[PDB]
Amino acid sequence: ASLLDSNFVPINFTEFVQAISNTYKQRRIQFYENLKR
Protein backbone atom coordinates (compact mmCIF):
# COMPACT_ATOMS: atom_id res chain seq x y z
CA ALA A 1 0.00 0.00 0.00
CA SER A 2 1.69 3.15 -1.29
CA LEU A 3 0.62 6.55 -2.59
CA LEU A 4 2.34 5.78 -5.91
CA ASP A 5 -0.44 3.38 -6.90
CA SER A 6 -3.35 5.00 -8.73
CA ASN A 7 -5.58 2.08 -7.70
CA PHE A 8 -4.86 2.62 -3.99
CA VAL A 9 -7.83 4.20 -2.21
CA PRO A 10 -7.19 4.73 1.52
CA ILE A 11 -10.05 4.04 3.91
CA ASN A 12 -8.91 5.92 7.03
CA PHE A 13 -6.13 8.07 8.44
CA THR A 14 -4.14 5.11 9.79
CA GLU A 15 -4.03 3.61 6.29
CA PHE A 16 -3.08 7.04 4.92
CA VAL A 17 -0.15 7.31 7.36
CA GLN A 18 0.97 3.75 6.57
CA ALA A 19 0.86 4.60 2.86
CA ILE A 20 2.96 7.72 3.50
CA SER A 21 5.55 5.65 5.38
CA ASN A 22 5.64 3.06 2.59
CA THR A 23 6.05 5.84 0.02
CA TYR A 24 9.00 7.25 1.98
CA LYS A 25 10.60 3.80 2.18
CA GLN A 26 10.11 3.21 -1.55
CA ARG A 27 11.58 6.63 -2.35
CA ARG A 28 14.63 5.80 -0.22
CA ILE A 29 15.06 2.49 -2.05
CA GLN A 30 14.71 4.21 -5.43
CA PHE A 31 17.25 6.88 -4.44
CA TYR A 32 19.78 4.23 -3.42
CA GLU A 33 19.12 2.32 -6.65
CA ASN A 34 19.70 5.42 -8.78
CA LEU A 35 22.69 6.66 -6.76
CA LYS A 36 26.07 6.25 -8.50
CA ARG A 37 29.00 7.36 -6.34
What does the alpha-carbon distance between residue 19 and residue 11 come to, in Å, rounded to a whole number?
11
Indicate whether 15 belongs to the interface with other proteins (CB under 8 A).
Answer: yes
Check residue 24 for interaction with other proteins (CB under 8 A). Answer: yes
33: enclosing H helix or E strand:
helix 13-34
| Residue 9 interacts with other proteins (CB under 8 A): yes or no | yes
| 7 contacts other proteins (rule: CB under 8 A) | no
Which residues contact residue 26 at a Cβ distance below 8 angstroms, ignoring those fewer than 6 apart?
2, 4
Residues that bind other proteins (CB under 8 A): 3, 9-13, 15-17, 19-21, 23-25, 27-29, 31-32, 35, 37
